[PDB]
Write a protein that holds these residues in place. Structure first.
Motif, PDB file in Angstrom:
ATOM      1  N   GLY A  20       0.720  -1.266   0.000  1.00 25.03           N
ATOM      2  CA  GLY A  20       0.000   0.000   0.000  1.00 25.03           C
ATOM      3  C   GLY A  20       0.750   1.319   0.000  1.00 25.03           C
ATOM      4  O   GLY A  20       1.528   1.605  -0.908  1.00 25.03           O
TER       5      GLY A  20
ATOM      6  N   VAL B 109       6.627  -7.214   8.044  1.00 30.49           N
ATOM      7  CA  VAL B 109       6.606  -8.576   8.568  1.00 30.49           C
ATOM      8  C   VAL B 109       6.534  -9.565   7.404  1.00 30.49           C
ATOM      9  O   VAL B 109       6.857 -10.744   7.559  1.00 30.49           O
ATOM     10  CB  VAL B 109       5.392  -8.831   9.494  1.00 30.49           C
TER      11      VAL B 109
ATOM     12  N   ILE C 127       0.584  -2.684  17.760  1.00 30.95           N
ATOM     13  CA  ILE C 127       1.176  -2.441  16.447  1.00 30.95           C
ATOM     14  C   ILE C 127       1.109  -0.974  16.021  1.00 30.95           C
ATOM     15  O   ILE C 127       2.130  -0.354  15.727  1.00 30.95           O
ATOM     16  CB  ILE C 127       0.479  -3.306  15.366  1.00 30.95           C
TER      17      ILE C 127
ATOM     18  N   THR D  87       2.230   7.829  10.287  1.00 38.18           N
ATOM     19  CA  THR D  87       0.947   7.641   9.626  1.00 38.18           C
ATOM     20  C   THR D  87      -0.184   7.521  10.639  1.00 38.18           C
ATOM     21  O   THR D  87      -0.267   6.545  11.386  1.00 38.18           O
ATOM     22  CB  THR D  87       0.938   6.376   8.737  1.00 38.18           C
ATOM     23  N   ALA D  88      -1.034   8.542  10.687  1.00 33.87           N
ATOM     24  CA  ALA D  88      -2.184   8.519  11.571  1.00 33.87           C
ATOM     25  C   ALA D  88      -3.335   8.053  10.683  1.00 33.87           C
ATOM     26  O   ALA D  88      -3.219   7.036   9.994  1.00 33.87           O
ATOM     27  CB  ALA D  88      -2.465   9.910  12.134  1.00 33.87           C
TER      28      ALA D  88
ATOM     29  N   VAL E 278      -7.696   9.667   9.386  1.00 37.20           N
ATOM     30  CA  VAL E 278      -8.742  10.631   9.693  1.00 37.20           C
ATOM     31  C   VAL E 278      -9.379  10.128  10.988  1.00 37.20           C
ATOM     32  O   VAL E 278      -9.981  10.898  11.736  1.00 37.20           O
ATOM     33  CB  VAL E 278      -9.814  10.717   8.579  1.00 37.20           C
TER      34      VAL E 278
ATOM     35  N   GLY F  45      -7.547   9.519   4.370  1.00 40.32           N
ATOM     36  CA  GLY F  45      -8.950   9.167   4.454  1.00 40.32           C
ATOM     37  C   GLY F  45      -9.191   7.908   3.642  1.00 40.32           C
ATOM     38  O   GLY F  45      -8.471   6.915   3.786  1.00 40.32           O
TER      39      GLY F  45
ATOM     40  N   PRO G 100      -4.870  -2.030   0.190  1.00 35.27           N
ATOM     41  CA  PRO G 100      -5.325  -3.330   0.693  1.00 35.27           C
ATOM     42  C   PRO G 100      -6.093  -3.244   2.017  1.00 35.27           C
ATOM     43  O   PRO G 100      -7.067  -3.975   2.222  1.00 35.27           O
ATOM     44  CB  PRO G 100      -4.023  -4.123   0.812  1.00 35.27           C
TER      45      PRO G 100
HETATM   46  N1  LIG Z   1      -8.628   5.803   6.360  1.00 35.08           N
HETATM   47  C1  LIG Z   1      -7.633   5.277   7.018  1.00 35.08           C
HETATM   48  O1  LIG Z   1      -7.641   5.118   8.259  1.00 35.08           O
HETATM   49  C2  LIG Z   1      -6.443   4.825   6.300  1.00 35.08           C
HETATM   50  C3  LIG Z   1      -6.429   4.542   4.812  1.00 35.08           C
HETATM   51  C4  LIG Z   1      -5.132   3.995   4.254  1.00 35.08           C
HETATM   52  C5  LIG Z   1      -4.034   3.779   5.096  1.00 35.08           C
HETATM   53  N2  LIG Z   1      -4.064   4.050   6.459  1.00 35.08           N
HETATM   54  C6  LIG Z   1      -2.849   3.807   7.302  1.00 35.08           C
HETATM   55  O2  LIG Z   1      -1.718   3.750   6.429  1.00 35.08           O
HETATM   56  C7  LIG Z   1      -0.752   2.782   6.897  1.00 35.08           C
HETATM   57  C8  LIG Z   1      -0.495   1.787   5.766  1.00 35.08           C
HETATM   58  O3  LIG Z   1      -1.744   1.220   5.401  1.00 35.08           O
HETATM   59  P1  LIG Z   1      -1.978   0.535   3.970  1.00 35.08           P
HETATM   60  O4  LIG Z   1      -3.246   1.087   3.383  1.00 35.08           O
HETATM   61  O5  LIG Z   1      -0.769   0.705   3.102  1.00 35.08           O
HETATM   62  O6  LIG Z   1      -2.194  -0.980   4.392  1.00 35.08           O
HETATM   63  P2  LIG Z   1      -1.480  -2.325   3.836  1.00 35.08           P
HETATM   64  O7  LIG Z   1      -2.049  -3.511   4.563  1.00 35.08           O
HETATM   65  O8  LIG Z   1      -1.559  -2.339   2.345  1.00 35.08           O
HETATM   66  O9  LIG Z   1       0.073  -2.130   4.250  1.00 35.08           O
HETATM   67  C9  LIG Z   1       0.398  -2.205   5.624  1.00 35.08           C
HETATM   68  C10 LIG Z   1       1.724  -2.944   5.720  1.00 35.08           C
HETATM   69  O10 LIG Z   1       2.136  -2.965   7.091  1.00 35.08           O
HETATM   70  C11 LIG Z   1       2.605  -4.290   7.368  1.00 35.08           C
HETATM   71  N3  LIG Z   1       2.504  -4.580   8.808  1.00 35.08           N
HETATM   72  C12 LIG Z   1       1.379  -4.823   9.526  1.00 35.08           C
HETATM   73  N4  LIG Z   1       1.666  -5.128  10.831  1.00 35.08           N
HETATM   74  C13 LIG Z   1       2.973  -5.056  10.952  1.00 35.08           C
HETATM   75  C14 LIG Z   1       3.901  -5.288  12.046  1.00 35.08           C
HETATM   76  N5  LIG Z   1       3.525  -5.726  13.203  1.00 35.08           N
HETATM   77  N6  LIG Z   1       5.240  -5.008  11.767  1.00 35.08           N
HETATM   78  C15 LIG Z   1       5.652  -4.598  10.596  1.00 35.08           C
HETATM   79  N7  LIG Z   1       4.854  -4.419   9.477  1.00 35.08           N
HETATM   80  C16 LIG Z   1       3.610  -4.653   9.693  1.00 35.08           C
HETATM   81  C17 LIG Z   1       1.718  -5.199   6.526  1.00 35.08           C
HETATM   82  O11 LIG Z   1       2.251  -6.523   6.349  1.00 35.08           O
HETATM   83  C18 LIG Z   1       1.589  -4.406   5.227  1.00 35.08           C
HETATM   84  O12 LIG Z   1       2.645  -4.718   4.315  1.00 35.08           O
HETATM   85  C19 LIG Z   1      -1.349   2.097   8.126  1.00 35.08           C
HETATM   86  O13 LIG Z   1      -0.837   2.703   9.318  1.00 35.08           O
HETATM   87  C20 LIG Z   1      -2.841   2.431   7.993  1.00 35.08           C
HETATM   88  O14 LIG Z   1      -3.495   2.367   9.283  1.00 35.08           O
HETATM   89  C21 LIG Z   1      -5.168   4.547   7.100  1.00 35.08           C
END
Ligand SMILES: NC(=O)c1ccc[n+]([C@@H]2O[C@H](COP(=O)([O-])OP(=O)(O)OC[C@H]3O[C@@H](n4cnc5c(N)ncnc54)[C@H](O)[C@@H]3O)[C@@H](O)[C@H]2O)c1
Ligand SMILES: NC(=O)c1ccc[n+]([C@@H]2O[C@H](COP(=O)([O-])OP(=O)(O)OC[C@H]3O[C@@H](n4cnc5c(N)ncnc54)[C@H](O)[C@@H]3O)[C@@H](O)[C@H]2O)c1
Ligand SMILES: NC(=O)c1ccc[n+]([C@@H]2O[C@H](COP(=O)([O-])OP(=O)(O)OC[C@H]3O[C@@H](n4cnc5c(N)ncnc54)[C@H](O)[C@@H]3O)[C@@H](O)[C@H]2O)c1
Ligand SMILES: NC(=O)c1ccc[n+]([C@@H]2O[C@H](COP(=O)([O-])OP(=O)(O)OC[C@H]3O[C@@H](n4cnc5c(N)ncnc54)[C@H](O)[C@@H]3O)[C@@H](O)[C@H]2O)c1
Lengths: 258, 258, 258, 258
Positions: free
Chosen positions: A15, A36, A114, A141-142, A144, A187, A192
C-alpha cells in the motif's frame, strides 16, 4: 529532492509504504524497507526497480511491536547506509470492527501494540540517531480516524489518535535540532487495508459498501496511493523545513466538512 | 511541476508573494502578479527573471478590497494567458495593534475589507473560471492567528479566521470538480509585515521584541519566505491532488504546542 | 447561579436568545434584551415573566451593525442596572444560500456586518465595562459553520469563523482580569433561523430537506433551544470560572464525526 | 440536577475525582467511587458526607488496568444501585518525564495500560449498561496533553490523545440511544498529580517550577479542583443533553493561545 538521501519505511511491503518507496526512489532516494511480510518486501523492491533501476534498496523483516526487532531494523539500516535522513513510521492494521461494548480487550490490545506502540518504538530508536546527526525528517501515519470519530473502531481510533499525540509531543522536543516530525491523516485511499475494511463493513457486498462510503466525500472519489506518496515526499523533503508538529489530512476534504 | 501552468498571485509585490513567484517560476510556471504597489511588482518581476530568465510575468496594479479592481486583475490574467491553473489568494495587512476595547471600528473594518473581503472576491471570480476549466488549485493565506489567539489583533484574528472559513466552505462546494482549495497558516516568518509587527510591539527596541517572541517556538528560529513558498508550491501542484479544505500551519510547531 | 446578576442578550427577541433569557431568569438573573424586532422583544419578556413573575427585564430596540445603536443598548443597560455580569453576544442572520461564485459581495457584506462586526462592536464596549468591574462572563454565538465547512454559505462561514477568532483573541487579552470569553457552536437546533434555512434548501419541500439533513447526525435528532440555553447558562456562570477561549459545539456530535 | 441519579467515578480517592464526588453529592447524587487506594476512598467518602450527610456512597478498591477488576467495580455498582446514570472515567497517572529517546518502553506501556486501556475497559462495560437503560452520560478525563504537545511525556501524550479518540469513536456509536460521551481537557489544576509533576520538573525547587509554568497562562493562575468538578457536573447532567463527542478544555485559555 532526495538524491543520496536515506529513507526508512515501515510497512514498506504494501500500500502506502510501497507507493511512497516508488515516489522517493524516483526522486533519487536510497531506501530501507521494513515489514513482517518478506513476500511484500520482495514485490515492493521490484516495483521500485521498475521506476529506478539504479536504486539501492534494503529489505528487512521485522515486527514493529517487538522492541528487539525495532532495534534490529534500525541497526540494519545504519550498517548499510550509515545514516537515516527520512523516516516514514507507517506500519499498521485496522482491527476487527465492533461497537465499543463488543470490541474486546484482546483486539484493543492487538491494535494498540502495532499501531501505537510500534510508532513509539520507531521514534524512540530513530530520533536518537537523528539528534546525533543534527538533522532528520519524520512522518507518522495517523488517519482521519486519528482526528475524528469513524465508529466501530475503538482500537484504531485510540491508537491513531495516540499517533497524533506522539507526533505533537516529539515534535516539541526535537524541533530545536532542525528535526521535523509530522503526521499524515489519510482518508478513503484505495489500498489493501481499505479494501479489506469494506469487506468487514459488508461481507455480502463489499462493492456496495465502498460505493456508499464515498458518496458524502467532497471530492466524490477515493484517493489513490500515489496521492499519499506525493504528500509524504513533501513532508520528508527540505520543502517542509519549517513545518512541524502538524497533521495533514489527505481525505478529499471530508474531515473539514460538517 | 508547473511547466506552462498559469499561477495568479495577489500580494505579489513583496514577501511571501514574491518568494512564491520565484519558486513557481523556477518550476516553469507562467505568472500573473497583483498588488497595490507598482514598484513592488517591478521588483518581484526582476527577482523572478533572475532565477528564470525566460519566465512570462504579467503585473497588474489593483486594490483587492475593490470589487471592480478584482474583476480587472482576473480579466487581465485571462486575456493574457487564457486560463488560471493556480491561485495564491495572499494579499493582506496586519492592522494597528490594540486591545479589543481600543481597536476601533475603523481599523477593524479596514483589516476585514482587505484580508477577508479581498479573499472572498478573489474566490468568487476565480472559482467560476476554474469550474469551467474542470481544474484548478487554490491556496488562501490565513495565519496562525487564523487558528489561535495571539492577542491585540481583533481585526487580524477575525479576518484570518474568516479566511479559514472561506477555505473550508468553498472546498466543500468545489471539490467535486477536481478543484482543491486549502489554506496555509504561517507563523513567525521574517517578511516586511512581521518586521513591522515587531516595530509595533516595541517601537523602542524592535529587535528585542523579535527575539523575545521567538524564544518559545519549538524550532527556536524564525522561518524564511522560501520555506513558505515551498509549501505553497506543493499545495498548488498535482502533488496535492487529494488534499482539500485543509489548513497547513508553517510555524515550527508552535500552534500544536501547549 | 444568577441571583441579582445582570445578563445582556443580543438577539433576545427570538430562538436561542429567548430560550437563554428564560433559563437565566429561572436562575434569578436580571435581564437586558436587545433586538431589531420590538414584537420579538415583548414576546420574550412575556415568556420570561411566565417562568419568573418577579424578573426585572429591560428591552431595547437596536441594530447591532450600527455602532451608535450598540453604544445605545450598552448605555441603556448600565443606566438601568449599573453593571453587566454576563453578555450573550448572539444576534445573527444566515444569509441567502449560494455557491461561492454566485454568493455576491452585497450579501457577503450584509452577513459580515451583522454576524461579525456586530459581535466585535459588542465586545469593544462591554469588555471595557467588565475590565473596570474586574469581572464578567461572555459567550459569543458561533456555529458549527464557524469550525467546519457546510457549503453554500460563504458569508456565514466567514463571519462565524471570524467570531471564533474574536473569541480566541479577546480571551487571551482579558483572561488576566478574571473575565472569561467563550463561544458556542450550535448545530441543527430547531429555531426560526434553521426553519428558514430548510426553506432555502428546498422551497417545495422544506420538511423533506430537514429530514434528510439530520439523518447523518450521531444523535439522530434536532436539538431544541432550551438545550442551548443550558450550555450558555453554564458558560455565563461561576461554574465556567476556569474555562476560557474555548468553542463548545452543541451539535449531537456531528462536528467530531468523520 | 442529580437527585437520586447514580454516578460512578474512577480515581475517586483523590484530586479531581474527589472534588467531583463532593459537587455531585451537593446536587443530590448517589455515588460509587473506585480507586486503588483504600485510604483515599475513605477520605473521599468522608469529604462527601461532610457536604451531604444524606448521601449514599459506595467505595470499591480496584485497579482499572485489570479487566477482571473493572468488571468487579461495575458489578458492585449495579448490585448496590441497580443502574448507572453518570460515569466519570477519570483514573490516571502522569508517568516519569523524559524525552522520547529516553522514555523507555516499560514506562510507555505502564502509562498506556492505566490511562488508555483503563478508559477503554470502563467504556466497554458501562456503555452496555447505559444502552440497555436507554440513557446515560459519560465524561472521560483527557488533558491539554491530549490535544496539544507538552513535551517530555510520550506516554501521557499518546494515552490522553487516545482517550480523546475513544471519546469521539464511542460518541458516534452511542449517540443514537440518547447517551452522551464527552471529554474534559484540564490544564494546570492544582491537584496531587500536578504538584508531583512540578517536583519532577525541578526536584530542587518545585515552587519555582510551578510559578514559571503558569506565567504564560492567559488567566495568570492555576485552576482549582472545584472548577473542574463544576464542568464535569454540567457534562453529566441534563444540561448537556445535546453536547456529544466534544473535548472541553479547562485551562484558563492556554490551548487556544498561540
Ligand atoms: N482511512 C484510514 O484510516 C487509512 C487509509 C489507508 C491507510 N491508512 C494507514 O496507512 C498505513 C499503511 O496502510 P496501507 O493502506 O498501506 O495498508 P497495507 O495492509 O496495504 O500495508 C500495511 C503494511 O504494514 C505491514 N505490517 C502490519 N503489521 C505489521 C507489524 N507488526 N510489523 C511490521 N509491518 C507490519 C503489513 O504486512 C503491510 O505490508 C497504516 O498505518 C494504515 O493504518 C489509514
Ligand atoms: N504570522 C502571521 O500572521 C503571518 C506572517 C507572514 C505573512 N502572513 C500573511 O501572508 C500574506 C503576505 O504577507 P507578507 O509577509 O508577504 O507581507 P508583505 O507586506 O511583505 O506583502 C504583502 C503584500 O500585499 C500587498 N497588499 C496589501 N494590501 C493590499 C490591497 N489592498 N490590494 C492588493 N495588495 C495589497 C502589499 O502591497 C504587499 O506587497 C499576508 O496575508 C499576511 O497576513 C501572516
Ligand atoms: N447551525 C447553526 O449555524 C445555527 C443554528 C441556530 C442558531 N445559530 C446562531 O445562533 C444565534 C441565534 O439565532 P436563532 O437560531 O435564535 O435565530 P433567530 O432568527 O430565531 O433569532 C435571531 C435574533 O437576532 C435578531 N437579529 C438579527 N439581525 C439583527 C441585528 N442587525 N440587530 C439586532 N438583532 C438582530 C433577530 O431579529 C432575531 O430575533 C445566531 O447568531 C445564529 O447564527 C446557528
Ligand atoms: N494537565 C493535566 O494533564 C491534568 C491536570 C490534573 C488532572 N489530570 C487528569 O485528571 C485525572 C485525575 O488526576 P488528579 O489530578 O485527580 O490526580 P490524583 O493523583 O490526585 O488522583 C488520581 C487518582 O487515580 C487513582 N489511580 C491511579 N492509577 C489507578 C489505577 N490503576 N486504578 C485505579 N485508580 C487509579 C489514584 O490512586 C488517585 O486516587 C487523571 O486522569 C489526570 O491525568 C490531567
Amino acid at each position: 529532492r532526495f538524491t543520496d538521501r536515506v529513507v526508512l519505511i515501515t510497512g514498506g511491503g504494501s500500500g502506502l509504504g510501497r507507493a511512497t518507496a516508488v515516489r522517493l526512489a524516483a526522486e533519487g532516494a536510497k531506501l530501507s524497507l521494513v515489514d513482517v511480510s518478506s513476500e511484500g518486501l520482495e514485490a515492493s523492491k521490484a516495483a521500485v526497480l521498475e521506476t529506478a533501476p539504479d536504486a539501492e534498496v534494503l529489505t528487512t523483516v521485522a515486527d514493529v511491536s517487538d522492541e528487539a526487532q525495532v532495534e534490529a531494523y534500525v541497526t540494519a539500516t545504519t550498517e548499510r547506509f550509515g545514516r537515516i535522513d527520512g523516516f516514514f513510521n507507517n506500519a499498521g492494521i485496522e482491527g476487527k470492527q465492533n461497537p465499543t461494548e463488543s470490541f474486546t480487550a484482546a483486539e484493543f490490545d492487538k491494535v494498540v501494540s502495532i499501531n501505537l506502540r510500534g510508532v513509539f518504538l520507531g521514534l524512540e530508536k530513530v530520533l536518537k540517531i537523528m539528534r546525533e546527526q543534527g538533522s532528520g525528517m519524520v512522518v507518522n501515519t495517523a488517519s482521519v480516524g486519528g482526528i475524528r470519530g469513524i465508529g466501530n473502531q475503538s482500537g484504531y481510533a485510540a491508537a491513531k489518535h495516540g499517533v497524533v499525540g506522539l507526533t505533537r509531543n516529539s515534535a516539541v522536543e526535537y524541533g530545536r535540532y532542525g528535526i521535523r516530525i509530522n503526521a499524515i491523516a489519510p482518508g478513503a485511499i484505495w489500498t489493501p487495508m481499505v479494501e479489506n475494511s469494506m469487506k468487514q463493513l459488508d461481507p455480502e457486498n463489499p462493492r456496495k459498501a465502498a460505493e456508499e462510503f464515498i458518496q458524502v466525500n467532497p471530492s466524490k472519489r477515493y484517493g489513490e496511493a500515489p496521492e499519499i506518496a506525493a504528500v509524504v515526499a513533501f513532508l520528508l523533503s527540505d520543502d517542509a523545513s519549517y513545518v512541524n508538529a502538524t497533521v495533514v489530512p489527505i481525505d478529499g476534504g471530508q474531515s473539514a466538512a460538517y
